Enzyme design. Structure first.
Site, short mmCIF file in Angstrom:
data_model
loop_
_atom_site.label_atom_id
_atom_site.label_comp_id
_atom_site.label_asym_id
_atom_site.label_seq_id
_atom_site.Cartn_x
_atom_site.Cartn_y
_atom_site.Cartn_z
N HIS A 15 38.92 -11.44 -4.98
CA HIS A 15 39.01 -12.42 -6.07
C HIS A 15 40.40 -13.05 -6.19
CE1 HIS A 15 35.34 -10.31 -7.18
NE2 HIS A 15 36.02 -9.18 -7.33
N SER A 23 38.54 -15.40 -1.30
CA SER A 23 37.97 -14.67 -2.42
C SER A 23 36.74 -13.90 -1.97
CB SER A 23 37.58 -15.63 -3.56
OG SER A 23 37.31 -14.91 -4.77
N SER A 60 34.94 -16.29 -8.82
CA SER A 60 36.00 -15.45 -9.39
C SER A 60 37.40 -16.02 -9.23
CB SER A 60 35.95 -14.05 -8.77
OG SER A 60 36.16 -14.12 -7.36
N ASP A 97 37.32 -6.23 -0.72
CA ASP A 97 36.75 -5.89 -2.02
C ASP A 97 35.26 -6.20 -1.93
OD1 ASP A 97 35.87 -5.80 -4.68
OD2 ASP A 97 37.77 -6.53 -5.49
N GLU A 116 38.63 -1.94 -1.99
CA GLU A 116 38.92 -1.94 -3.42
C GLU A 116 37.86 -1.23 -4.26
OE1 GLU A 116 41.60 -2.93 -4.80
OE2 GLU A 116 41.19 -3.36 -6.93
N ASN A 132 39.38 2.68 -4.33
CA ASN A 132 38.61 2.78 -5.56
C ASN A 132 38.82 4.13 -6.24
OD1 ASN A 132 36.40 1.62 -7.37
ND2 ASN A 132 35.49 3.58 -6.80
N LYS A 163 42.92 3.78 -10.27
CA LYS A 163 42.02 2.67 -9.99
C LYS A 163 40.69 2.91 -10.71
CE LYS A 163 39.39 -0.53 -8.13
NZ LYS A 163 37.90 -0.65 -8.26
N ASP A 165 40.81 0.64 -13.78
CA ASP A 165 40.18 -0.63 -13.45
C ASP A 165 38.69 -0.61 -13.79
OD1 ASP A 165 38.55 -2.34 -11.65
OD2 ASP A 165 40.42 -2.83 -10.63
N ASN A 166 37.91 0.29 -13.18
CA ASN A 166 36.46 0.20 -13.32
C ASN A 166 36.04 0.35 -14.78
OD1 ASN A 166 37.24 0.61 -10.65
ND2 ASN A 166 35.26 1.50 -10.07
N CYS A 185 36.79 -3.19 -17.55
CA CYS A 185 35.54 -3.77 -18.04
C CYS A 185 35.48 -3.73 -19.56
CB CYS A 185 34.34 -3.07 -17.41
SG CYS A 185 34.16 -3.46 -15.63
N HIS A 189 29.03 -5.44 -8.53
CA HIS A 189 29.62 -6.30 -7.51
C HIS A 189 28.72 -7.46 -7.11
CE1 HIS A 189 32.65 -7.29 -4.58
NE2 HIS A 189 31.67 -7.54 -3.72
N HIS A 192 39.87 -8.53 -14.99
CA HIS A 192 40.72 -7.56 -15.65
C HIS A 192 42.10 -8.14 -15.92
CE1 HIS A 192 37.46 -5.08 -14.72
NE2 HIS A 192 37.98 -4.27 -13.82
N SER A 227 45.47 -0.72 -9.75
CA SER A 227 44.69 -0.93 -8.53
C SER A 227 45.56 -1.47 -7.41
CB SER A 227 43.53 -1.89 -8.79
OG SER A 227 42.87 -1.54 -9.98
N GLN A 277 46.67 -0.48 -3.61
CA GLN A 277 46.40 -1.28 -2.42
C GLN A 277 47.64 -1.39 -1.54
OE1 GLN A 277 44.09 -2.42 -0.73
NE2 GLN A 277 42.27 -2.72 -2.01
N1 LIG Z 1 33.25 -6.40 -12.38
C1 LIG Z 1 34.26 -5.56 -12.19
O1 LIG Z 1 35.44 -5.86 -12.52
C2 LIG Z 1 34.01 -4.31 -11.41
C3 LIG Z 1 34.98 -3.30 -11.39
C4 LIG Z 1 34.76 -2.14 -10.68
C5 LIG Z 1 33.57 -1.98 -10.00
N2 LIG Z 1 32.64 -2.95 -10.04
C6 LIG Z 1 31.30 -2.77 -9.40
O2 LIG Z 1 30.40 -2.29 -10.36
C7 LIG Z 1 29.42 -1.43 -9.73
C8 LIG Z 1 29.43 -0.06 -10.36
O3 LIG Z 1 30.70 0.58 -10.10
P1 LIG Z 1 31.03 2.03 -10.68
O4 LIG Z 1 32.38 2.43 -10.25
O5 LIG Z 1 30.67 2.11 -12.13
O6 LIG Z 1 29.97 2.94 -9.92
P2 LIG Z 1 29.37 4.32 -10.42
O7 LIG Z 1 28.69 5.02 -9.26
O8 LIG Z 1 30.43 5.12 -11.06
O9 LIG Z 1 28.26 3.98 -11.54
C9 LIG Z 1 27.03 3.27 -11.28
C10 LIG Z 1 26.00 3.99 -12.11
O10 LIG Z 1 24.73 3.30 -12.09
C11 LIG Z 1 23.73 4.28 -12.24
N3 LIG Z 1 22.46 3.70 -11.83
C12 LIG Z 1 22.05 3.44 -10.54
N4 LIG Z 1 20.86 2.92 -10.45
C13 LIG Z 1 20.44 2.82 -11.77
C14 LIG Z 1 19.25 2.34 -12.36
N5 LIG Z 1 18.21 1.88 -11.65
N6 LIG Z 1 19.16 2.38 -13.71
C15 LIG Z 1 20.19 2.87 -14.41
N7 LIG Z 1 21.35 3.36 -13.97
C16 LIG Z 1 21.42 3.30 -12.63
C17 LIG Z 1 24.21 5.45 -11.39
O11 LIG Z 1 23.63 6.70 -11.76
C18 LIG Z 1 25.72 5.44 -11.68
O12 LIG Z 1 26.06 6.37 -12.71
C19 LIG Z 1 29.74 -1.48 -8.23
O13 LIG Z 1 29.02 -2.56 -7.66
C20 LIG Z 1 31.25 -1.77 -8.24
O14 LIG Z 1 31.71 -2.30 -7.00
C21 LIG Z 1 32.83 -4.09 -10.72
N1 LIG Z 2 41.80 -9.91 -12.39
C1 LIG Z 2 41.31 -9.40 -11.25
N2 LIG Z 2 41.90 -9.72 -10.08
C2 LIG Z 2 41.41 -9.20 -8.94
N3 LIG Z 2 40.38 -8.38 -8.78
C3 LIG Z 2 39.80 -8.08 -9.95
N4 LIG Z 2 38.72 -7.26 -10.17
C4 LIG Z 2 38.50 -7.27 -11.52
N5 LIG Z 2 39.36 -8.00 -12.19
C5 LIG Z 2 40.18 -8.53 -11.20
K LIG Z 3 43.01 -11.65 -15.82
#
Ligand SMILES: NC(=O)c1ccc[n+]([C@@H]2O[C@H](COP(=O)([O-])OP(=O)(O)OC[C@H]3O[C@@H](n4cnc5c(N)ncnc54)[C@H](O)[C@@H]3O)[C@@H](O)[C@H]2O)c1
Ligand SMILES: Nc1ncnc2[nH]cnc12
Ligand SMILES: [K+]
Ligand SMILES: NC(=O)c1ccc[n+]([C@@H]2O[C@H](COP(=O)([O-])OP(=O)(O)OC[C@H]3O[C@@H](n4cnc5c(N)ncnc54)[C@H](O)[C@@H]3O)[C@@H](O)[C@H]2O)c1
Ligand SMILES: NC(=O)c1ccc[n+]([C@@H]2O[C@H](COP(=O)([O-])OP(=O)(O)OC[C@H]3O[C@@H](n4cnc5c(N)ncnc54)[C@H](O)[C@@H]3O)[C@@H](O)[C@H]2O)c1
Ligand SMILES: NC(=O)c1ccc[n+]([C@@H]2O[C@H](COP(=O)([O-])OP(=O)(O)OC[C@H]3O[C@@H](n4cnc5c(N)ncnc54)[C@H](O)[C@@H]3O)[C@@H](O)[C@H]2O)c1
Ligand SMILES: Nc1ncnc2[nH]cnc12
Ligand SMILES: [K+]
Ligand SMILES: [K+]
Ligand SMILES: [K+]
Lengths: 462, 464, 461, 460
Positions: free
Chosen positions: C53, C76, C81, C131, C156, C181, C186, C190-191, C195, C315, C374, C382, C386
């Site tokens: 991103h 990206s 993003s 990522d 990532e 990750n 991280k 981050d996760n 969020c 993701h 974030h 994070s 890296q």
């Molecule tokens: N948008 C963001 O900024 C951001 C940040 C970090 C990670 N992510 C992404 O978000 C996703 C989740 O990451 P995470 O670290 O929380 O993973 P995680 O493994 O910790 O959590 C995912 C959860 O989903 C649950 N799950 C799976 N299938 C399901 C279903 N059918 N119904 C209900 N629950 C279900 C699993 O049991 C698990 O607990 C990944 O794709 C990751 O790459 C996004």
């Molecule tokens: N601000 C940000 N920059 C890069 N990667 C990210 N993933 C989630 N938030 C982000």
């Molecule tokens: K930001």
């Protein structure tokens, strides 16, 4: 000392009560500030106060403040379960007439009130009344009208007691003026809300030791008590639903993050079992009544509740829950004092391992005082500093000595001026270590207030 | 729509279709206001009303405007703040044939010109007979500059705390010329809009302006009234460590009980004018200061000098003079980050080092930050406020104060609130919009607590 | 005369630079590494393909890698993003970057290819920062001869790590990787907390909906689901949580959430009849957080309350069956990355129809699609990881090892706990926090060194 | 039946009423009763047990008995027993030696009474321990008994540390299961249990308002996380101290200010290193570390007048209570609540304002001043305990050849599948509904529909 003019559970608890009173004084800066401020003036010299309010440690500090300001008192509790026996003992051992213990019967409760009214079998020379709930006020009006001729005023603690005072005034039967202590902001929006926030989950934990996080609660009502009660459960992680008849209070519940529901389908309580939302009530682990109203947890609700749900009331009177229905139809198993399993399988006997029961706390009486110790000293500081100021004001007005024409002009139910409300609040804030900012003269002028306050118009809701 | 319509001034008419899309969404979020539209459209209770309106030209105000029009009114509109207009909302209203003079980023001269364009039509005073105001600026200009127009006006419906205060001062001084309704002090306004609105929109605006993490950082909220309560919650719920200042001991008590430390920017709470009275140790730890008071100079020059490097400064009260931004314009160099976000470099007046570490971040140049850096309160909250506004307009327009003889006029020259029954009916529609179910009292229950089954349920003294 | 880039608008560079300078002040761990390692130049000779991103935060990461000696070519990892002012500032600094907000799928692929190829031939890349795994997959499928010269991949996010582990399991992974990750600074920063900050942020920016008092359903309660559920509950939403993992479900319950399933008795058999219609008809907002496929499916979408908001913070967009909605329902764009989906049919819509859903970012990562992802102070953790991971694998020089030594080092590993703790300490100091130092007697008592690490590798925090 | 010692056997009926209620609050534990009752997997087991003799431990005990075991029981803290629980267990014919308010000598005597039957070592073959005191006594004083014991199942963080130290030193004699580090134990018990029971205990002991007052929580591991939440949710202004920068990072992100009692965090031993301005503002300090002397003498001297001092870690040496016994006068308010007068050692003024309130004499405050964790939380810990006892007992380590014993002498955890199965029963107790993956979804994320759903490295 020759002192026998009392009746408590165990006078030998006095030393323990005194130790807790000394701790509570350090938690009650507004009340103790009034003691120091008015001790030399003795503004209650000649006052003879009939007091009816929960005989707790906090009430003990209130009593000794009134006495330190010059008053004499005769005291009783306003609930059969709310006395702390060590508090009552410390007060009796100090030579103060008190008639109160935890676990009174209804007949003993009435006898206790009568022991404050009568001394040596004749009416005490009372001239002031401090009440919580209106029971003492009612007995004086119905049974002792000649005593009210010489009484200068009533200072009433709680919402239910105020309502009864306003009904008397409306019907023209109120005989002496009153101060509504409940509606000071440092009472209503401190005691009624934050006190229940502290003491509701407290009483539930002491009575059941149930985990609350993750379970379903239904709070009936969202006034000051219902707001504090709902926060008490939500802050523990309960999933709290709120019921209300006032759509404004319901709006606040929504904005505060609660789902608003009714025990009745579309909210219509037509008295039939078919009107009960059985799906909703079958998921509730804990119901709490907060309304001051009658029968808001009714018989059909009780029959529909999830097995092993906890049922309790934190409003002033036990008739919020239809416990009479439960005494008539279901078998009661005492777990321990103020904790009963109510077995819905029948009236005659129970199976010790039956799974279909409810847990009722304090037999439906005020659960925070019945199963724990009510509100903490630092919150009661605000309520009881207001009580003392209200006693000073009405005793100095001397209503009973006024000519009839002047009595007619002063027969009312009033609140304390806002300036005094603020002065109580400032002592509470200082107790936390808070530092209030002083307006500059230009800032005071800009918003239209004196630098020392009051800071808000009387319409302000906070 | 009307052919040849030119009686408006907005930033970009091409945003109108976008604005209309958001108005249609907002209608679904405002059930009390849309309920009034359905209930009263046939009766046309505002037929003949000619309303001068001055309130933030947002999507929410757009739904208010079109409700008044739907009930029969003509309106001429401006914003009550230079930064609070949403340009797509203004464009949609202008495209609907409604005179509106408003854009985001007005100058002060343009702001006054916009109000005057509502007051005048074709070079001459419009035959207005109603006023809807937010903050008192339109009310003030009419009394100050066009006093003869007030001879035809039946009432003013004032939105916000600061505006009501000005009205009450005018009433006390004998200078208020028409009756007014205090819309602010409906419970479904004050204890909804002022508190919950700021809870939603304060952290929203800070995030949009700075994208700063708030969790773990130190905030100071000046004031703990309705706006201060909502603002403190906005930040505490993000995980800020929030300290609260107050002059009112009752509000300070609530802050303590709500779990906040109550502190003063001044040692022992006494501002003696000098830098020595500033609690420099306190201010040097603050990452974010928010003013919420409706008072003057509550974040002053000495406080600004003492704040921690790179702290964010903002105001969510009605007027920018809560913060001494004039001192900062006089003495410090301003670097625009993006619109309504300025770094203020405390190193000097003339230039600045692009990498200087000693700056503050000021949002919306000190103007209402929720409207300046985001979109203000959400539709479902503004529903309550604007339903009250419509009921207030109907009530005063039907009273016809300007048509009364002089004697009867003095008897009705007042500032009133709406009755509690109407406050409750607004609340009921809001609760239904959440899917909430209000319980109905039985007759025996209503008798027991001394109310009617249909309400009102509380005495006028009740504080909720 | 630098032309080796493609961004939306290069004139946004000055604005991006102003925001980078602010972000630097919000990223003490990352700038601490910049200052600590600048003289040593530990990435001198590193040539990094980067796919993540193109935000302001990524800008600070890129310029830290460059400050430590690296050359990079950047894209990206998501079509929505990029912050265009960040991409402009990076391009204006002479760094190859191919990224803009609002890419098509074809453009997204072309951007990654522009990092891989220089002057129409494979770049002399020797490191990968990824990522989600898309760049990693293209290299393995299409450019194996490039992987021969690459020393490692630093990945990532949860989904990308899963893809790495599948390759390792199948014997198809060609270079070692660091799972960035699963640093605590991280994953549990981050996760989760990222969020928490940015989910309600993006929902407000896209809809301006009041959230207090409304009903939400969060699918999943891992790190992202935990942070997302808190993002909504702290706003006053009534939040229900779905989970397939009973340990995560137990945490949701203890955290004060009601745990529900979209399906009766949790059985997803594919029938409309299996949908808990009463539940779905109450939900105002559904958020998917799983990294899984089709966890908000067509039958759920058909049963949702009218006007509910649908979004995804995992993701990839296949968490939601948006393909079903494209095939069957009419899309009305409100504004960029906000669409009303009219369930009345496919052939047009009534502008005043009430039966619609609101989809955010077309089902792509909503925090980045509808806001800015974030915040800098969270991404600090994070991206410090890296940088350290890039240094570690570049210094190991896997590509230069004999075949027998490659086999001993082909793995997916995490950074050591001591590094994780040192990143955390700079983060804590950024808040002004003061960590206590153990006495010798205390360190002996609990059996740790005074400087750490303070926990066994099994510790879960 | 006379093989027991409790405070008051007439409390048995009361204890039995509360056990029947607790059974309804412990679905995972009662599920194990139903599913293993037929097999009787613990038939022949003779379990020495040492853990807080609460109502919750009573349901654990009767589960072990229901599955075939014999036991002899004691508490692992002098203040943690619930006298009605101990009475109910004794009245059931189960040997138990435990009451609330033991002396240190009585505490040791109680453990000895489980070890010895009729003046001779009992033929024990399994150990269940909470904190490692029974484990330590067997190794140091009764080493020959350990030749017949198949394993130890240890409950808590401190006891696990003691077990690992013995394993590292080559002095551990039998295999052990670390029950603490099941997720349905550590991340349920240690955190959420303290969230429920810390503020509970402080209220019962002092009835102090907590809203608006300042707290300092020393430590931010699982117990410090739950403790900090217990206080913050009541409206306290909570500051957190930590030596672990990762845990400190979590405290910051969770919305707490991170501070040290010492200037710049350097604890050099002098009064001069104390941050007197910070400590002079604190109304409540809670230690959560499992470490030694984290609320030390100089901190105690610097604390705000009338501050509450308490400890929720396993051992009372987190607070320097010996210093206070040596130098200051103790006034008992009521059992497990003492005012400590900083005016001097010999006597005190009943109205002195310069005192601190110590809860439970520095012992585990949640069990000392309230009832510890609630039944529904202890369900998770104790279901793990039962499963761990079944596993080690069926392995029969004591009966293995020497070379087989060498491979089996370790400290292990239970497999994730069992951890998840406990969690599923807990979730069902809340009425929660876990979703089942489709086969395509399971394949997509690389797990079985049955689980386990996470790798062993996952931290939750
Ligand atoms: N948008 C963001 O900024 C951001 C940040 C970090 C990670 N992510 C992404 O978000 C996703 C989740 O990451 P995470 O670290 O929380 O993973 P995680 O493994 O910790 O959590 C995912 C959860 O989903 C649950 N799950 C799976 N299938 C399901 C279903 N059918 N119904 C209900 N629950 C279900 C699993 O049991 C698990 O607990 C990944 O794709 C990751 O790459 C996004
Ligand atoms: N601000 C940000 N920059 C890069 N990667 C990210 N993933 C989630 N938030 C982000
Ligand atoms: K930001
Ligand atoms: N236990 C305590 O420590 C304590 C403290 C203060 C007051 N009280 C008592 O608690 C009661 C409530 O006091 P309050 O100050 O909150 O009063 P209140 O008027 O502020 O609130 C009571 C609420 O109950 C609601 N209500 C009435 N009937 C209802 C029904 N059938 N269903 C649902 N909601 C219904 C009303 O709409 C109102 O909002 C009174 O009896 C008061 O004396 C107890
Ligand atoms: N931005 C918005 O969306 C929005 C919404 C509603 C109101 N407002 C405006 O916000 C302002 C506040 O409105 P309100 O309803 O909260 O008023 P309020 O009267 O309820 O609260 C203002 C508070 O500021 C306190 N205060 C005054 N001077 C102070 C000082 N020097 N230091 C500390 N505290 C001080 C007062 O004691 C009072 O409690 C007004 O200008 C109002 O018009 C803004
Ligand atoms: N009372 C209860 O109900 C209960 C429940 C579970 C565990 N415990 C006990 O509580 C203690 C802690 O258990 P845990 O599971 O949280 O362990 P933990 O390892 O997760 O947490 C202890 C924390 O204390 C920190 N710490 C150590 N020394 C410190 C110091 N000088 N200053 C500040 N922080 C310091 C460590 O960094 C660590 O994060 C153990 O003794 C455990 O047996 C008690
Ligand atoms: N502790 C207390 N003492 C007296 N009255 C009370 N009302 C509520 N709590 C109380
Ligand atoms: K109390
Ligand atoms: K808005
Ligand atoms: K318990």
């Amino acid at each position: 000392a020759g002192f026998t003019d009392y009746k408590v559970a165990d006078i030998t608890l006095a030393a323990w009560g005194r130790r807790e009173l000394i701790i509570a004084e350090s938690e009650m800066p507004a009340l103790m500030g009034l003691r120091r401020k008015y001790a030399g003036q003795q503004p209650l010299k000649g006052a003879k106060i009939l007091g009816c309010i929960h005989m707790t440690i906090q009430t003990g500090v209130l009593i000794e403040t009134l006495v330190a300001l010059g008053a004499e008192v005769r005291w009783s509790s306003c609930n059969i379960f709310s006395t702390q026996d060590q508090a009552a003992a410390a007060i009796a051992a100090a030579g103060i007439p008190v008639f109160a213990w935890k676990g009174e019967t209804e007949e003993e409760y009435e006898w206790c009130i009568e022991q404050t009214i009568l001394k040596d079998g004749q009416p005490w020379d009372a001239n002031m009344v401090l009440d919580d709930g209106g029971d003492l006020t009612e007995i004086l009006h119905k049974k002792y009208p000649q005593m009210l001729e010489r009484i200068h005023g009533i200072t009433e603690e709680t919402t239910t007691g105020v309502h009864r005072l306003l009904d008397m005034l409306k019907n023209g039967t109120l005989k002496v003026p009153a101060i509504n202590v409940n509606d000071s902001v440092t009472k209503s929006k401190n005691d009624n809300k934050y006190g229940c926030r502290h003491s509701l989950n407290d009483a539930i934990k002491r009575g059941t030791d149930h985990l609350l996080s993750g379970k379903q609660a239904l709070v009936i009502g969202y006034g000051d008590v219902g707001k504090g009660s709902s926060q008490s459960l939500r802050q523990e992680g309960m999933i709290v639903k709120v019921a209300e008849v006032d759509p404004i209070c319901a709006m606040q519940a929504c904005m505060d993050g609660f789902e608003v529901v009714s025990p009745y389908k579309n909210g219509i309580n037509d008295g039939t079992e078919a009107s009960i939302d059985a799906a909703l009530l079958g998921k509730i682990d804990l119901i709490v009544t907060t309304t001051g109203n009658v029968n808001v947890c009714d018989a059909n609700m009780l029959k529909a509740l999830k097995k092993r749900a906890v049922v309790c009331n934190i409003g002033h009177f036990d008739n919020e829950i239809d416990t009479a229905f439960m005494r008539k139809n279901w078998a009661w198993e005492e777990v321990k004092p103020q904790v009963h399993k109510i077995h819905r399988t029948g009236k005659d006997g129970f199976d010790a391992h039956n799974d279909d029961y409810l847990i009722l706390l304090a037999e439906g009486r005020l659960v925070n005082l019945g199963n724990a110790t009510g509100h903490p000293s630092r919150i009661m500081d605000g309520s009881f500093a207001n009580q003392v100021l209200a006693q000073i004001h009405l005793f100095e007005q001397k209503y009973a000595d006024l000519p009839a024409a002047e009595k007619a002009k002063r027969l009312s139910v009033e609140v304390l001026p806002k300036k005094l409300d603020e002065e109580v609040a400032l002592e509470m804030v200082k107790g936390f270590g808070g530092v209030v900012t002083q307006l500059t003269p230009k800032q005071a002028e800009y918003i239209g207030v004196s630098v020392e306050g009051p800071f808000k118009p009387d319409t302000y809701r906070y």
